[PDB]
């Protein structure tokens, strides 16, 4: 479990060599109603349900159902002029105030980025001191071992 990361200064060939050892072991071991049914089918087919574009299609000198269509166009134009009249009265001002709301929301995300960045550096900073201390304990252990191997041959 103990693998030093900052201490071990591990080639890419060792990553390929260790992965083959892992791969060799790997070879050995070897809530809705009907709206969900429509939404899953439409996305799987990738096809969208068609809307009514008949109001764009209407033409003069046509039958009684199309007389209903042209009067529908008159009610849509009166509503469209009323909707355009509200926007003109509001002015850009209304588009301006929603833009100020977006800058405040955007700034909150950037502060969350610094908070996470400060904390992930702190977890790394605590780990770096532990690795250097684990380095000297391992290095002193290796030096004592190389002394004992040399001494035992010298005594014999």
């Amino acid at each position: 479990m103990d693998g030093l990361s900052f201490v071990d200064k591990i080639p890419d060939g060792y990553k390929n060599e260790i992965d083959q050892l892992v791969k060799k072991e790997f070879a050995n071991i070897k809530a809705d109603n009907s709206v969900s049914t429509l939404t899953n089918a439409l996305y799987t087919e990738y096809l969208k349900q068609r809307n009514n574009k008949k109001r764009r299609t209407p033409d003069f000198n046509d039958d009684d159902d199309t007389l209903f269509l042209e009067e529908y166009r008159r009610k849509y134009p009166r509503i469209d002029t009323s909707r355009y009249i509200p926007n003109e009265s509001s002015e850009v001002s209304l588009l301006g105030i929603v833009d100020s709301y977006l800058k405040h929301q955007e700034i909150v995300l950037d502060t969350l980025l610094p908070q996470t960045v400060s904390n992930q550096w702190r977890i790394n900073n605590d780990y770096i001191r532990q690795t250097c201390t684990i380095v000297e304990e391992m290095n002193i252990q290796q030096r004592k071992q190389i002394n004992d191997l040399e001494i035992y041959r010298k005594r014999l």
Binding site: L4, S5, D19, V22, D32, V35, S36
Partner: protein
């Protein structure tokens, strides 16, 4: 479709303009002639304070519930997306913690194989001589 004095289906639904509760014309009038008060909140109430008719005038007794049905089905869509993203990020933590630890445990083998190899050549050159 219930009166708030006896509990019968109101055939002439009247209401007091002090505490909003639909009563029946017979029972609330018998309460007011008893004591001049509202039965629910015990506030001041009279006979002329009562509103006593079916209200339908200039109104002409569909569209609106279809938008309410469209609100209700979106309400399920939002709750489903929350539980679906919650399970996404929770196993992504399990995916991340495993893959980092797998490569961390992978570095254990690269260190351990090289030390095992050093003990092989050390002993063989020693046991030969």
């Amino acid at each position: 479709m219930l009166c708030a004095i006896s509990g019968k289906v109101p055939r002439r639904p009247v209401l007091s303009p002090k505490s909003r509760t639909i009563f029946e014309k017979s029972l609330l009038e018998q309460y007011v002639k008893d004591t001049g008060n509202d039965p629910i909140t015990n506030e001041p109430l009279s006979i002329e304070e009562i509103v006593e008719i079916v209200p339908s005038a200039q109104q002409a007794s569909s569209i609106p519930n279809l938008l309410t049905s469209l609100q209700n089905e979106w309400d399920a869509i939002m709750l489903e997306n929350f539980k679906l993203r919650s399970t996404l990020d929770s196993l992504t933590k399990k995916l991340s913690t495993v893959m980092y630890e797998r490569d961390a445990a992978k570095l254990v083998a690269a260190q351990l194989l090289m030390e095992k190899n050093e003990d092989s050549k050390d002993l063989p050159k020693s046991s030969q001589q």
